Each structure stands twice: as C-alpha cells, then as structure tokens.
Design an enzyme around this catalytic site. Sequence first.
Site: not given
Ligand SMILES: [Mg+2]
Ligand SMILES: [Zn+2]
Length: 313
Positions: A68, A72, A106
Amino acid sequence: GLMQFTLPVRLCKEIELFHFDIGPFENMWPGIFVYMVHRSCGTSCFELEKLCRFIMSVKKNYRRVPYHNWKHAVTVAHCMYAILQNNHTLFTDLERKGLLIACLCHDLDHRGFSNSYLQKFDHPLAALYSTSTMEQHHFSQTVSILQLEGHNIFSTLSSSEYEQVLEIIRKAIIATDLALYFGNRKQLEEMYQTGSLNLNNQSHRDRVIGLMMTACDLCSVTKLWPVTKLTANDIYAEFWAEGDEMKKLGIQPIPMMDRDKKDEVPQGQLGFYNAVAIPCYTTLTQILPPTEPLLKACRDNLSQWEKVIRGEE
Ligand SMILES: [Mg+2]
Ligand SMILES: [Zn+2]
Ligand SMILES: Cn1ncc(C(=O)NCCO)c1C(=O)Nc1ccn2cc(-c3ccccc3)nc2n1
C-alpha cells in the site's frame, strides 16, 4: 502551456494498454501521472506548478510499506487512465479530473493494516470512523493536502463544481472499501440484467464509478503473469505482518494472514479470483464493453494459479 510531457517510445505505446507496468524507476512515476492527466483530462485541466506540488505532497504521505505504497497509487491511477481513454464520451469533464486524483489519493497514509486490525487494536481512527475506517482517513488526508498553500489544483472551479468534484473523490475513495464492493456489484448486476441501469441517473453513475474503483484497485490480477506473481509477494508480506500483530493481541489470524499457512496461497488466490476479481471485471465489461481486456487478463491469471496447484509451476 506549450510544455507537453513525452515518454520514450516503448512507454508511449504500452501506457495505453490495460496491462502496463509502471516500472522500477520511481523518479519517472510523477511524469507518467502528469502525461496521463494531460491526455485523459487536457493540458488546461490543472496549473502545472500546482499539480506537480500536489503530486509530491501526495507521494510524501504514502508510507514505506510492502504493497500500500506510492507505486500502488500510480498503478491504480494508470488502470483508471486506460478505462477513461477506452470510454472517451461516457464521462463528464469533472469526472475525468476527479477520478485520476481519487486513484492517486485512495490509500494515502496507509499503515499496511486492514480496518479489522485497527478495530481489534482499538486504534484512535476506529473511534473517529466506525466503518470504512482507513478509507475515511484517506479522504481526510486528500482534503488536508488540497488545503496546503499552492496545492489547490481545483482553484479555477466554481464553488458548486468544487463541491461536485470533492463529492466524486469522496465516493470513489469510500468505494475502495472491499466490504462495500459485494453489495454494489450485486445491485449493478440486477440493474443491468433487468435493463433498469441508467447512466443519466446520478445514484447509478455513483455505483458504476464505485465498480471502476474496485477494478482499478484490484488491477494486480490483470497484469501479465510475472507481474501478478511478483506483486502477490508484496500483498502477502503485508497480510502476514498483520497476522503477526493479530497473534501479539492473542488472536489467531485468518489463514490469509497466517505465514504458517503459506502452502495454501494458491487455493486462496483461486477463491479470490472466483469470489471477487472475475465477478468484478465481468460486471464492469457488461456495463463498459471496452474494458474486456481486464477480464481476459484476469482469466489468464486464474488459469496460471490453476497450473501452480497442479504442480506444472
Ligand atoms: Mg485501500
Ligand atoms: Zn488500494
Ligand atoms: C484485497 N486485495 N487486493 C489485491 C489482492 C490480491 O490478492 N491480489 C493478487 C496479486 O497478484 C487482494 C486480496 O484480497 N487477496 C486475497 C483475498 C482473499 N484471500 C484468501 C487467501 C488465502 C487463504 C488461505 C491461505 C492463503 C491465502 N488469500 C487471499 N488473498
């Protein structure tokens, strides 16, 4: 104004394709994003100085976690770029602006732990946001960066346009909570099959953008096999670290997060392709036919995991 971004020939061609990998050169990722905004949205969408300063503050607020991370963020933005470029006329000016930014932001300030782990740890974020805990935090971090001096990339929008774009971004980011995906896809499946799906209906557009966000977020399963296989290593590095932390709280983690059950990964990936990934890209392809290459690549990767189980690799 007359300053375009250009990529080398191989990147210029392959970046248009759904299965593009952004490569290991981190210092090229900001340029790749700006290129995608300029072609997707226009050279006039954002003040270049403001956009560049926004990108570098977003990058700084992604952590050095196995999966993450900043790579990403840009990967998910590229999948959204490919969807928007293959569906030219379906999306408003504000949607094209909002969605590439929503994808980049995000997972802002992700710690490598699920909503579940924050709740069991009793993290302060779990008291502030009872559901979609990390995703409400990601949106909160996005608004924080947009309000830094010289970082307001939407400054030329009217009050009401600004509120619409931040509402597009909020819904898009919340929709990346996989707990919300199952219900959202079931509703889109029923609306499509009874023929009641209506892209002029705003609550319908919201559902379709939500599914695009799941599809972009899961796009590791839509790459060529060697990328998909190597990305799995980063995914399980996070899952297994969270498992370790569950055991420190005196809780047996699910097998997905238990490094002692590494041997069951192939079967676990099958379940995930069958229960989440294939259904996601199937429904997406029904609503947006030109996203079919995502479904084809997912099916190709499902077949590769079936080979792993049969000992052919
Ligand atoms: Mg997420
Ligand atoms: Zn994600
Ligand atoms: C959320 N998200 N985003 C990307 C991906 C992803 O996995 N992408 C592949 C990238 O190549 C996922 C993901 O949820 N994967 C899952 C889901 C359920 N699982 C159950 C097991 C399992 C069970 C038992 C034993 C060993 C594993 N493993 C699982 N993995």
